[PDB]
């Protein structure tokens, strides 16, 4: 595998401060299996997300499950079996800031990871044991499938 | 960090700086050093590098190579910021108040 | 010992390039291998980057003493 993180997320709010943009919506989500809160921008024109939807979000280091990190360039035209065939939405971006929780003065374990998908931001916040394998200046694939 | 900073700052080329600037760097590096302690106390990081969830070392990371490049960049930017001999410094003063 | 700054100032750089351009405009030997450049000031800039310019800058302190610095042994900068 080349998976960093994987969990099922439930959408809890769609626009906290109003609809600032047409195509983009700021999804605030919470995970069942782990206590992870998720901020995520998605293009809601190509992929529409509703306030009750439940989706599976995998973050992966490589899009080919055989664990070959060979990415000189990404060719859209090329067709081979990959991980994206199982998922509806895919984004490519870079982890750019790992930051500690400020809200407790002692004995804390929550971490924030920030990923930017060309300006579509993600904050993934949770226990340090679940965010393992994130490093600054690393490039990750988000993958996302809605569940019935 | 403090030990490695004072090893670089005692090299001969740093002696050409004004002492006020060398104090400001040491004051800044001491400030940076205290943030590392506060984070490592909060998260239970051990300075020997042994702690298992390795992502904790990203929080206030600083490496010897980065400290060396930092001190050279500061010292260079100070020397190149001095008012060069020959500068018609009265004419710049005159126009900067006139405009 | 020489006490003045080791960096070449913009005024020293401007006048070395100027005096060398005027000397290359007259029929002086060019110390670098020129490569089809015609403009004298462009040739002088190659000689500065190659540290081949035969000029000594005599820095003058206001009491009348002097320091002789070679153009090749100053630290050049943009």
XYZ file of C-alpha atoms in Angstrom:
325
model
C 0.000 0.000 0.000
C 0.866 3.686 -0.067
C -2.050 4.802 2.069
C -1.413 7.399 4.770
C -4.889 7.717 6.270
C -8.377 6.298 5.744
C -11.689 6.814 7.533
C -15.417 7.300 6.963
C -16.571 10.912 7.427
C -20.030 12.406 8.009
C -20.778 15.923 6.743
C -21.874 18.216 9.581
C -21.954 21.677 7.969
C -21.753 22.964 4.393
C -21.213 26.729 4.654
C -20.499 28.178 8.119
C -20.151 31.832 7.054
C -22.374 31.878 3.978
C -21.846 30.962 0.343
C -18.724 32.988 -0.420
C -18.094 31.237 -3.755
C -20.105 29.446 -6.415
C -18.074 26.340 -7.297
C -16.391 25.824 -3.889
C -18.036 24.932 -0.546
C -16.324 24.621 2.857
C -17.328 21.198 4.228
C -16.945 20.695 7.986
C -17.009 16.962 8.759
C -16.521 14.498 11.614
C -15.328 10.871 11.510
C -16.932 7.804 13.109
C -13.959 5.457 13.712
C -11.579 8.074 15.115
C -12.214 11.492 16.633
C -11.114 13.416 13.549
C -12.601 16.707 12.443
C -12.144 17.670 8.816
C -12.249 20.977 6.975
C -12.403 20.377 3.233
C -12.981 22.491 0.129
C -14.577 20.597 -2.758
C -15.729 21.710 -6.204
C -19.500 21.349 -5.773
C -20.201 21.909 -9.445
C -18.533 18.704 -10.665
C -19.249 16.873 -7.364
C -22.308 17.878 -5.315
C -22.238 17.306 -1.541
C -25.311 17.564 0.704
C -25.579 18.277 4.429
C -26.296 14.659 5.404
C -23.903 12.756 3.146
C -21.449 10.153 4.423
C -18.234 9.547 2.480
C -15.020 7.516 2.610
C -11.837 9.574 2.416
C -8.485 7.960 1.696
C -5.247 9.939 1.526
C -2.545 8.144 -0.426
C 1.074 8.764 -1.318
C 0.791 6.980 -4.656
C -2.112 6.335 -6.985
C -0.877 2.845 -7.951
C -1.441 0.263 -5.200
C 1.740 -1.696 -6.078
C 3.696 0.974 -4.129
C 5.685 2.449 -7.015
C 6.317 6.121 -6.174
C 7.333 6.857 -9.788
C 5.712 10.213 -10.598
C 7.893 12.086 -13.075
C 4.728 13.603 -14.556
C 1.051 12.644 -14.398
C -0.454 11.604 -17.730
C -4.276 11.861 -17.816
C -4.472 10.075 -21.188
C -2.737 6.888 -19.946
C -5.078 4.110 -18.821
C -3.938 1.429 -16.367
C -5.628 -0.014 -13.273
C -5.115 2.303 -10.320
C -6.714 3.364 -7.062
C -8.850 6.140 -8.603
C -11.059 3.565 -10.372
C -12.722 2.830 -7.014
C -13.252 6.492 -6.052
C -15.399 9.294 -7.457
C -13.347 12.405 -6.595
C -9.536 12.764 -6.590
C -7.312 15.748 -5.786
C -3.536 16.239 -5.848
C -1.894 18.585 -3.367
C 0.960 19.195 -0.962
C 1.135 18.944 2.827
C 2.456 22.344 3.846
C 2.064 22.889 7.609
C 1.984 20.549 10.597
C 0.971 22.454 13.709
C 0.227 21.678 17.334
C -3.027 22.193 19.210
C -2.810 25.400 21.257
C -5.947 24.767 23.337
C -4.317 22.804 26.189
C -1.307 23.935 28.215
C -0.189 20.409 29.165
C -0.348 16.727 28.150
C -1.727 17.122 24.632
C -1.834 14.767 21.636
C -3.945 16.555 18.989
C -2.168 17.633 15.796
C -3.278 19.596 12.750
C -2.164 18.710 9.235
C -2.734 21.265 6.488
C -2.884 20.204 2.827
C -3.405 22.671 -0.031
C -4.935 21.404 -3.270
C -3.892 24.312 -5.466
C -5.648 26.646 -3.030
C -8.461 24.316 -1.949
C -7.438 23.805 1.670
C -7.818 20.843 3.992
C -7.298 20.764 7.748
C -7.146 17.275 9.221
C -7.093 17.313 13.010
C -6.814 14.340 15.318
C -4.592 12.202 17.500
C -0.910 12.089 16.518
C -1.029 8.291 16.124
C -3.531 8.626 13.260
C -1.689 11.445 11.466
C 1.556 9.444 11.351
C 3.331 9.446 8.015
C 2.539 13.067 7.236
C 5.616 15.199 6.619
C 5.986 18.782 5.462
C 6.687 19.296 1.727
C 5.146 15.915 0.840
C 2.634 15.411 -1.961
C -0.554 13.414 -1.384
C -3.635 12.249 -3.283
C -7.029 12.768 -1.701
C -9.605 10.202 -2.762
C -13.282 10.331 -1.918
C -16.383 8.169 -2.494
C -19.909 8.826 -1.220
C -21.683 6.015 0.634
C -25.371 5.127 0.348
C 20.460 24.765 19.534
C 22.156 27.235 21.910
C 25.360 25.160 21.924
C 25.473 24.916 18.116
C 24.670 28.629 17.681
C 27.560 29.780 19.888
C 29.876 27.401 18.032
C 29.145 29.144 14.720
C 28.950 32.697 16.131
C 32.508 32.501 17.522
C 34.011 32.034 14.034
C 36.249 34.859 12.851
C 33.962 36.383 10.200
C 31.258 37.231 12.753
C 33.669 39.556 14.617
C 33.197 42.226 11.912
C 29.577 42.811 12.971
C 28.441 45.483 15.394
C 27.871 43.969 18.837
C 24.260 45.218 18.928
C 23.474 42.923 15.982
C 25.124 39.879 17.580
C 22.994 40.410 20.697
C 19.771 40.566 18.643
C 20.575 37.226 16.978
C 21.322 35.567 20.333
C 18.157 37.091 21.787
C 16.208 35.684 18.819
C 17.817 32.212 18.996
C 17.104 32.089 22.739
C 13.478 32.927 21.935
C 13.329 30.119 19.346
C 14.936 27.707 21.835
C 12.198 28.350 24.412
C 9.409 27.446 21.953
C 11.052 24.050 21.382
C 10.982 23.321 25.135
C 7.308 24.356 25.511
C 6.204 22.085 22.654
C 8.369 19.138 23.719
C 7.090 19.488 27.285
C 3.462 19.503 26.081
C 3.763 16.491 23.770
C 6.225 14.435 25.819
C 8.934 14.462 23.179
C 12.307 13.062 24.267
C 15.408 14.841 22.970
C 17.165 11.541 22.126
C 14.897 11.060 19.078
C 13.499 7.722 20.272
C 9.773 8.563 20.551
C 7.595 6.383 18.347
C 5.074 8.719 16.555
C 7.799 10.411 14.501
C 5.471 13.197 13.246
C 5.976 14.996 16.609
C 9.450 16.115 15.442
C 7.795 18.303 12.772
C 6.215 20.671 15.309
C 9.157 23.029 15.992
C 11.784 21.417 13.797
C 15.221 22.967 13.365
C 18.348 21.330 11.991
C 22.095 22.226 12.173
C 22.206 22.876 8.405
C 19.327 25.347 8.755
C 21.018 27.126 11.677
C 24.261 27.463 9.674
C 22.468 28.847 6.607
C 20.448 31.221 8.817
C 23.474 32.819 10.496
C 25.273 33.250 7.169
C 22.208 34.861 5.545
C 21.799 37.307 8.450
C 25.493 38.258 8.583
C 25.597 38.750 4.798
C 22.411 40.886 4.731
C 23.876 43.074 7.482
C 27.167 43.742 5.682
C 25.413 44.499 2.383
C 22.989 46.885 4.150
C 25.673 49.364 5.237
C 25.673 52.847 3.702
C 28.368 52.556 1.075
C 31.252 55.061 1.111
C 30.816 57.801 -1.435
C 27.039 57.987 -1.022
C 25.666 61.501 -1.520
C 23.690 61.094 1.656
C 22.651 64.736 2.021
C 20.927 64.785 -1.369
C 18.937 61.691 -0.413
C 17.978 63.356 2.886
C 16.925 66.560 1.091
C 14.670 64.791 -1.408
C 13.198 62.398 1.173
C 11.845 65.286 3.244
C 10.933 67.425 0.217
C 8.817 64.927 -1.732
C 46.502 45.906 7.444
C 43.670 47.454 5.414
C 40.693 48.632 7.455
C 38.129 49.686 4.834
C 35.292 47.452 3.658
C 36.135 44.442 1.444
C 32.981 44.827 -0.658
C 33.132 46.767 -3.895
C 30.766 49.694 -3.719
C 28.362 50.576 -6.531
C 30.377 53.745 -7.228
C 33.621 51.794 -7.595
C 31.842 49.294 -9.854
C 30.330 52.069 -11.993
C 33.674 53.826 -12.538
C 35.786 50.695 -13.129
C 33.345 49.537 -15.824
C 33.335 53.061 -17.259
C 37.100 53.527 -17.369
C 37.611 50.017 -18.721
C 34.939 50.584 -21.415
C 36.693 53.778 -22.475
C 39.990 51.887 -22.584
C 38.443 49.010 -24.592
C 36.889 51.573 -26.962
C 40.407 52.723 -27.737
C 42.556 49.898 -28.995
C 43.614 48.325 -25.664
C 44.187 44.564 -25.298
C 41.099 42.685 -24.160
C 41.979 40.237 -21.403
C 39.000 37.895 -21.841
C 38.170 35.958 -24.999
C 35.402 38.063 -26.514
C 32.652 36.204 -28.379
C 31.294 38.612 -30.972
C 30.335 41.401 -28.581
C 30.816 44.878 -30.041
C 29.640 47.177 -27.228
C 32.662 48.149 -25.054
C 30.667 48.207 -21.799
C 29.485 44.619 -22.316
C 33.095 43.476 -22.761
C 34.102 45.292 -19.555
C 31.373 43.432 -17.661
C 32.817 40.090 -18.810
C 36.267 41.173 -17.588
C 34.813 42.136 -14.186
C 33.063 38.772 -13.764
C 36.269 37.024 -14.876
C 38.292 39.244 -12.452
C 40.710 40.245 -15.241
C 40.397 44.075 -15.059
C 43.842 45.733 -14.530
C 42.692 48.623 -12.316
C 43.672 49.375 -8.708
C 41.167 51.372 -6.654
C 42.930 53.823 -4.345
C 40.517 54.383 -1.477
C 41.140 57.757 0.147
C 40.637 58.429 3.819
C 39.875 62.094 4.620
C 43.199 62.684 6.398
C 45.094 61.950 3.167
C 46.248 58.373 3.696
C 45.321 55.744 1.133
C 44.681 52.041 0.592
C 45.386 50.297 -2.716
C 42.788 47.598 -3.411
C 42.844 45.370 -6.459
C 39.583 45.075 -8.381
C 40.136 41.308 -8.413
C 40.372 41.084 -4.603
C 37.281 43.072 -3.656
C 34.082 41.095 -3.097
C 31.881 42.059 -6.048
C 28.098 42.027 -5.704
C 24.992 43.154 -7.556
